[PDB]
Coordinates of C-alpha atoms in Angstrom, one line a residue:
Chain B
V3 CA 0.2 0.1 -0.1
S4 CA 2.4 2.5 1.1
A5 CA 5.0 1.6 -2.7
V6 CA 2.0 2.0 -4.2
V7 CA 0.9 5.7 -3.3
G8 CA 4.7 6.8 -3.3
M9 CA 4.7 5.6 -7.0
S10 CA 1.4 7.6 -7.6
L11 CA 2.5 10.5 -5.7
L12 CA 5.5 10.9 -7.4
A13 CA 4.1 9.9 -10.5
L14 CA 1.3 12.6 -10.4
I15 CA 4.0 15.8 -8.9
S16 CA 6.2 14.4 -12.2
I17 CA 3.1 14.9 -14.4
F18 CA 2.3 17.9 -12.6
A19 CA 5.5 19.6 -13.1
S20 CA 6.5 19.3 -16.2
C21 CA 3.1 20.6 -17.8
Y22 CA 3.8 23.5 -15.3
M23 CA 7.0 24.2 -16.8
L24 CA 5.9 23.7 -20.5
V25 CA 2.5 26.6 -20.3
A26 CA 5.1 28.4 -18.6
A27 CA 7.9 28.5 -22.1
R28 CA 5.1 29.1 -23.5
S29 CA 4.1 31.6 -21.8
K30 CA 7.5 33.2 -21.8
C31 CA 8.0 33.0 -25.8
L32 CA 4.8 34.4 -26.6
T33 CA 5.6 37.3 -24.3
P34 CA 7.2 40.1 -26.4
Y35 CA 4.6 39.9 -29.7
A36 CA 1.8 40.5 -26.7
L37 CA 4.2 44.1 -26.4
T38 CA 4.2 45.3 -29.2
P39 CA 3.1 48.5 -30.0
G40 CA -0.2 46.8 -33.3
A41 CA 1.3 43.6 -34.6
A42 CA 0.8 40.6 -34.9
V43 CA 2.2 36.8 -33.9
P44 CA 3.0 34.3 -37.1
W45 CA -0.3 32.8 -38.1
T46 CA 3.3 29.4 -38.3
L47 CA 3.3 29.9 -34.2
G48 CA -0.4 30.6 -33.6
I49 CA -1.2 27.8 -35.1
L50 CA 1.8 25.7 -32.9
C51 CA 0.1 27.4 -29.7
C52 CA -3.3 28.6 -28.8
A53 CA -2.2 32.2 -29.3
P54 CA -5.2 35.2 -29.0
Chain V
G12 CA 6.7 77.6 -30.6
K13 CA 3.8 75.9 -31.7
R14 CA 5.6 72.8 -31.5
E15 CA 6.0 72.8 -27.7
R16 CA 2.1 73.5 -28.0
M17 CA 1.0 70.6 -30.2
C18 CA 3.5 68.9 -27.4
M19 CA 1.8 69.6 -24.5
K20 CA -1.7 69.0 -26.2
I21 CA -1.1 65.4 -27.4
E22 CA 0.9 65.0 -23.8
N23 CA -2.9 66.2 -21.8
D24 CA -4.5 63.2 -23.4
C25 CA -2.4 60.5 -23.5
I26 CA -0.1 60.4 -20.9
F27 CA -2.3 59.4 -17.6
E28 CA -0.2 59.3 -13.7
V29 CA -0.3 57.0 -10.6
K30 CA -0.4 57.6 -7.3
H31 CA 1.4 56.0 -4.6
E32 CA 1.2 57.2 -0.5
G33 CA -0.7 60.4 -2.2
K34 CA 2.9 61.2 -4.7
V35 CA 3.2 61.4 -8.6
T36 CA 5.7 58.5 -9.3
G37 CA 5.4 57.3 -13.2
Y38 CA 3.6 57.8 -16.0
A39 CA 1.1 55.8 -18.1
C40 CA 0.5 55.7 -21.4
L41 CA -1.2 54.6 -24.2
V42 CA -0.2 53.5 -28.2
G43 CA -2.1 52.6 -30.8
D44 CA -4.2 49.7 -28.6
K45 CA -2.2 49.8 -26.3
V46 CA -1.9 51.4 -22.4
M47 CA 2.1 50.8 -21.2
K48 CA 3.4 51.3 -17.3
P49 CA 6.5 50.7 -16.9
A50 CA 7.0 48.3 -14.3
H51 CA 8.9 49.0 -11.3
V52 CA 7.1 52.1 -9.9
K53 CA 4.3 51.0 -7.4
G54 CA 1.1 52.5 -7.4
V55 CA -2.3 52.6 -8.7
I56 CA -3.6 54.8 -12.3
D57 CA -5.4 58.0 -10.7
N58 CA -8.5 56.3 -13.0
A59 CA -11.5 54.7 -12.5
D60 CA -11.7 52.4 -15.6
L61 CA -7.7 51.9 -17.0
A62 CA -6.9 50.3 -12.9
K63 CA -9.9 47.8 -13.3
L64 CA -8.4 46.0 -16.1
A65 CA -5.6 42.6 -15.9
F66 CA -2.4 44.1 -16.8
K67 CA 0.7 41.6 -19.1
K68 CA 3.4 42.3 -16.4
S69 CA 6.8 41.4 -17.4
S70 CA 9.9 42.1 -15.6
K71 CA 12.1 41.8 -18.2
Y72 CA 11.7 44.2 -20.1
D73 CA 10.0 45.6 -16.7
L74 CA 6.8 46.5 -18.3
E75 CA 2.7 45.2 -18.0
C76 CA 0.4 46.7 -20.7
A77 CA -3.2 45.7 -21.6
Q78 CA -5.7 46.5 -24.8
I79 CA -6.8 49.6 -24.5
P80 CA -11.1 50.1 -23.5
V81 CA -12.6 50.5 -26.9
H82 CA -15.1 54.2 -25.5
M83 CA -11.3 55.7 -25.1
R84 CA -9.6 54.1 -27.6
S85 CA -9.3 57.5 -29.9
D86 CA -6.6 59.3 -28.0
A87 CA -3.7 57.1 -29.6
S88 CA -0.6 57.5 -30.7
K89 CA 0.2 57.0 -33.8
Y90 CA 2.7 54.3 -33.1
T91 CA 6.2 54.5 -35.4
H92 CA 9.5 52.5 -35.5
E93 CA 11.8 54.1 -38.6
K94 CA 15.0 55.8 -36.2
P95 CA 16.9 57.7 -37.9
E96 CA 19.5 59.1 -37.0
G97 CA 19.2 62.8 -35.7
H98 CA 16.9 65.2 -32.6
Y99 CA 13.9 63.7 -31.1
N100 CA 11.5 65.8 -29.3
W101 CA 10.4 65.2 -25.6
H102 CA 8.1 66.8 -23.1
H103 CA 11.8 68.4 -21.0
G104 CA 14.1 69.6 -23.9
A105 CA 14.9 68.1 -27.2
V106 CA 17.4 65.1 -27.4
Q107 CA 19.3 63.6 -30.0
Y108 CA 19.6 59.9 -30.9
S109 CA 22.8 59.6 -32.2
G110 CA 25.2 56.2 -32.3
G111 CA 22.3 53.8 -31.5
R112 CA 21.5 56.1 -28.5
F113 CA 20.1 58.5 -26.6
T114 CA 21.3 61.3 -25.2
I115 CA 19.8 64.8 -23.7
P116 CA 22.2 67.5 -21.2
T117 CA 23.2 66.7 -18.2
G118 CA 19.9 67.1 -15.4
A119 CA 16.6 67.5 -16.9
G120 CA 15.0 64.4 -15.6
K121 CA 14.6 64.1 -11.9
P122 CA 13.3 60.7 -10.2
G123 CA 10.0 59.7 -10.1
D124 CA 9.9 61.0 -14.3
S125 CA 10.0 57.6 -15.9
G126 CA 7.2 56.6 -18.2
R127 CA 7.7 59.4 -20.3
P128 CA 7.4 59.3 -24.5
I129 CA 10.0 60.4 -27.2
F130 CA 8.3 61.9 -30.2
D131 CA 9.3 62.1 -34.1
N132 CA 9.3 64.9 -36.0
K133 CA 6.2 64.6 -37.6
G134 CA 4.4 64.3 -33.9
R135 CA 5.1 59.8 -33.5
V136 CA 6.6 58.2 -29.9
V137 CA 9.4 56.7 -31.2
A138 CA 10.7 55.0 -27.2
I139 CA 9.5 54.8 -23.6
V140 CA 11.5 55.9 -21.3
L141 CA 12.9 53.5 -18.1
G142 CA 16.2 55.2 -16.6
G143 CA 19.4 57.8 -17.5
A144 CA 22.7 57.3 -16.7
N145 CA 25.4 60.1 -16.6
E146 CA 28.7 61.0 -18.0
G147 CA 30.6 64.0 -18.2
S148 CA 27.8 66.7 -18.7
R149 CA 25.2 64.4 -21.2
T150 CA 23.0 61.8 -19.6
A151 CA 22.3 58.6 -21.7
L152 CA 18.7 57.4 -21.3
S153 CA 18.3 54.1 -20.9
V154 CA 14.4 53.5 -22.4
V155 CA 11.8 50.3 -25.8
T156 CA 12.2 50.3 -28.5
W157 CA 9.7 48.8 -30.5
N158 CA 11.3 47.4 -33.9
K159 CA 9.7 45.6 -36.5
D160 CA 8.3 42.8 -34.0
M161 CA 10.6 42.3 -30.8
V162 CA 10.2 45.1 -28.6
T163 CA 13.8 45.0 -27.6
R164 CA 16.4 47.3 -24.5
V165 CA 18.9 49.1 -24.8
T166 CA 20.1 49.9 -21.3
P167 CA 24.0 52.5 -20.8
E168 CA 25.5 50.7 -17.7
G169 CA 25.4 52.2 -13.8
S170 CA 22.0 53.8 -15.2
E171 CA 19.6 54.2 -12.4
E172 CA 16.2 53.4 -12.1
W173 CA 13.7 56.9 -12.1
Chain X
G17 CA -16.7 71.3 -55.8
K18 CA -16.3 69.4 -58.6
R19 CA -14.5 65.8 -57.2
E20 CA -17.8 66.3 -55.4
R21 CA -19.7 66.3 -58.9
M22 CA -17.8 64.3 -60.7
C23 CA -18.6 61.7 -56.9
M24 CA -22.4 61.6 -57.8
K25 CA -21.6 61.8 -60.5
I26 CA -20.0 58.3 -60.6
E27 CA -22.6 57.0 -58.3
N28 CA -25.7 58.0 -59.3
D29 CA -24.7 56.0 -62.3
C30 CA -23.3 52.9 -60.3
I31 CA -24.2 53.0 -57.2
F32 CA -28.3 51.3 -57.0
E33 CA -30.8 50.9 -53.8
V34 CA -31.6 47.5 -51.8
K35 CA -35.9 47.4 -50.6
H36 CA -37.6 45.7 -48.4
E37 CA -40.8 47.1 -46.9
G38 CA -41.6 50.0 -49.0
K39 CA -37.4 51.7 -47.2
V40 CA -34.4 51.9 -47.9
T41 CA -32.3 48.7 -46.5
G42 CA -28.6 49.3 -47.6
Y43 CA -27.0 49.6 -51.2
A44 CA -25.6 47.8 -53.7
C45 CA -22.4 48.6 -56.1
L46 CA -20.9 47.4 -59.1
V47 CA -17.2 47.5 -59.9
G48 CA -14.7 46.3 -62.3
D49 CA -17.0 43.7 -63.9
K50 CA -19.0 42.2 -60.8
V51 CA -22.2 43.1 -59.0
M52 CA -21.4 43.1 -55.3
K53 CA -23.3 43.5 -51.6
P54 CA -23.3 43.0 -48.4
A55 CA -24.9 40.2 -46.8
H56 CA -26.4 41.5 -44.6
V57 CA -28.9 43.5 -45.9
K58 CA -32.1 42.0 -46.9
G59 CA -33.8 43.0 -49.9
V60 CA -34.9 43.6 -53.2
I61 CA -32.1 45.0 -55.6
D62 CA -34.1 48.7 -57.3
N63 CA -34.0 47.4 -60.5
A64 CA -35.9 44.3 -62.8
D65 CA -33.3 42.5 -64.2
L66 CA -30.2 42.8 -61.5
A67 CA -32.8 40.8 -59.3
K68 CA -33.0 38.3 -61.9
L69 CA -29.8 36.6 -62.3
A70 CA -28.4 34.1 -59.9
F71 CA -25.8 35.9 -56.7
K72 CA -23.0 34.3 -54.7
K73 CA -22.7 33.6 -51.5
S74 CA -19.9 33.2 -48.7
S75 CA -20.6 33.8 -44.6
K76 CA -17.2 34.7 -44.0
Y77 CA -16.4 37.6 -45.6
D78 CA -20.3 38.5 -45.4
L79 CA -21.4 39.2 -48.8
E80 CA -22.5 38.2 -52.0
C81 CA -21.6 39.1 -55.8
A82 CA -22.1 37.9 -59.1
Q83 CA -21.1 38.7 -63.2
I84 CA -22.1 41.6 -64.3
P85 CA -24.3 41.9 -67.5
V86 CA -23.4 42.5 -70.5
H87 CA -24.7 45.7 -72.0
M88 CA -24.3 48.0 -68.0
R89 CA -20.8 46.4 -68.6
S90 CA -20.2 50.3 -70.3
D91 CA -20.7 51.4 -66.6
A92 CA -17.8 50.3 -64.4
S93 CA -16.5 51.7 -61.6
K94 CA -12.5 51.7 -62.3
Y95 CA -10.9 49.1 -58.8
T96 CA -7.4 49.1 -58.0
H97 CA -5.9 47.2 -54.9
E98 CA -2.9 50.2 -54.4
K99 CA -3.7 52.1 -51.1
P100 CA -1.5 54.8 -49.5
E101 CA -1.8 56.2 -45.8
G102 CA -3.8 59.7 -46.2
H103 CA -7.4 61.2 -47.2
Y104 CA -10.0 59.4 -48.7
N105 CA -13.3 60.4 -50.2
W106 CA -17.2 59.1 -49.0
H107 CA -20.5 60.4 -50.3
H108 CA -20.4 60.9 -46.0
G109 CA -17.4 62.8 -45.9
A110 CA -13.9 62.2 -45.9
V111 CA -11.9 59.2 -44.2
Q112 CA -8.7 58.9 -43.2
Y113 CA -6.8 56.2 -44.0
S114 CA -3.6 55.8 -41.2
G115 CA -2.2 52.1 -39.0
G116 CA -4.5 49.9 -41.3
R117 CA -7.6 51.3 -40.3
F118 CA -10.3 53.7 -42.0
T119 CA -12.1 55.8 -39.6
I120 CA -14.4 58.2 -40.0
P121 CA -15.5 61.2 -37.9
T122 CA -17.6 60.9 -35.2
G123 CA -20.9 59.9 -36.0
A124 CA -21.5 59.8 -39.9
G125 CA -22.4 56.5 -41.2
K126 CA -26.4 55.9 -40.0
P127 CA -27.7 52.3 -39.9
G128 CA -28.8 50.7 -43.4
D129 CA -26.1 52.8 -45.0
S130 CA -24.4 49.8 -45.8
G131 CA -22.6 49.1 -49.6
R132 CA -21.5 52.3 -49.9
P133 CA -18.1 52.0 -52.1
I134 CA -15.4 54.4 -51.0
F135 CA -13.4 55.8 -53.5
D136 CA -9.8 57.2 -53.6
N137 CA -7.7 60.4 -54.6
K138 CA -7.9 59.7 -58.5
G139 CA -11.8 58.2 -58.3
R140 CA -11.3 54.7 -57.9
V141 CA -12.9 52.0 -55.3
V142 CA -10.9 50.2 -53.4
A143 CA -13.2 48.7 -50.3
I144 CA -16.5 49.0 -49.5
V145 CA -18.1 49.6 -45.8
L146 CA -19.8 46.9 -44.4
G147 CA -20.6 47.8 -40.2
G148 CA -18.5 51.0 -38.2
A149 CA -18.1 50.7 -34.0
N150 CA -17.7 54.8 -32.3
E151 CA -15.6 56.1 -30.3
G152 CA -14.9 59.4 -28.9
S153 CA -14.8 61.6 -31.8
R154 CA -14.5 59.1 -34.2
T155 CA -15.8 56.1 -35.7
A156 CA -13.1 52.8 -36.7
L157 CA -14.9 51.2 -40.0
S158 CA -14.6 47.6 -40.9
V159 CA -14.5 47.1 -44.5
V160 CA -13.2 44.3 -47.1
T161 CA -10.4 44.8 -49.6
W162 CA -9.6 43.8 -52.7
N163 CA -5.4 42.7 -51.3
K164 CA -3.5 40.7 -55.0
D165 CA -6.4 37.9 -56.0
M166 CA -7.5 37.4 -52.1
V167 CA -10.7 39.4 -50.5
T168 CA -9.9 40.2 -47.1
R169 CA -11.9 41.2 -44.4
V170 CA -11.0 43.6 -41.0
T171 CA -13.7 45.2 -38.8
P172 CA -12.6 46.3 -35.2
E173 CA -13.2 45.4 -31.8
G174 CA -17.1 46.4 -30.5
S175 CA -18.2 46.7 -34.7
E176 CA -21.7 47.2 -35.1
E177 CA -23.8 45.8 -37.4
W178 CA -25.4 48.4 -39.7

C-alpha cells in the first residue's frame, strides 16, 4: 500500500511539474509579441501554440 | 513655439499619472491599441476604469501592458518604428538619437519622471523612458523601442531607475 | 466642388439601392466586372434584371457577388488595389486611412447605410463599407479590400452591424 501510494504521488508530481513548466515556456516565448504596439503573431506560431 | 504647444496638447490626454501614498511616482502611456506602464513604479493609476482591468506584466523588459478599452480608443499616439539619425522632441527638452543611443543634456529628468514618451518630428512616439545614467555633461537614457515586432531594450552601464 | 460633382456623377450611375418593406435598407455596388452587396442586408434590389440573375454568397467574408450583365458593362467602376495612407473620399465626407484602419469623424453613418464604396483620390474604388464601431469623436470602419487576388476582411473590436 505504501509503495503504490508513493509511486502514484511521484508520477503525479512529475506530470504536474512538467506541464506547468511547458505552460511557462509557452508563456515566455509568446510574451514579447503581446507588448508590441500593434503587430500580430505569425500564423505559424499562432497555430503551433494557442495565440489570442 | 507651436510644436511645443502641440506636444503639450498630445501629452495632455495621452499620458496618465500613477499615485502612491499621496505622491506622483510615474506616468502611463496609450500607444496604438496598448496601455503601457513601466514595472519599476508601484502605485494605483489615477483613473476610474484603467486600473480595473488585468495587466500583462514582464520583469525582463520592466513593463506591463493591457488592451485599451474601446470607449477611449481615440486618444491614440500613432506609433512608429523608424529610428533615423538626428533629433527627437521630449517633454523636458530636445533629446538626440546618435550612434544608437539617446542622449539628453545633463540634468533634465528627475527621479519619479519615468514613463514619458519620446516623440518624433511628425508627432509619432518611438520609445518610452525607463532610466538614465550620466557621463560628463550628458545623460544617456535607457528606454525600450519597438523595432519590427520585438520590443528590444537598451540600457547603458550604471543606469539608475527613476 | 468639382470632385464632389464627379463623385455623385459616378454614384448616380453605378450605385443601386435595395428595397424592403418600402424603406431603404442598403446599397449594392458595381465594381469592375462584378455586382457586389453585403450579406447582412436583406431586401429586393431596385432594378428589374439585376435581381433576376443568380448571385453567389459567402458568409466568411460576409457578402454576395455575381457577374455583370453584358449591356451594363459600359458603366464601369475602375477598381484598384494600391492602398497608401492619408485621406479618402466618401459620399458622407472624408475618411482617414491610418494604421491599416479606416476612420470617419464621430457619427456620420446611420445604420442601413452599408454598401457605399470608398473612392480614392483619382476616383477609383478601394473598399466597400460593412460596419463601424464608434469611439470618442471618431469611428473605426469595417470594410472589405482586394489585396492582390484575395478579398480580405477587417473588423475592429466592438463593431456594430450596419
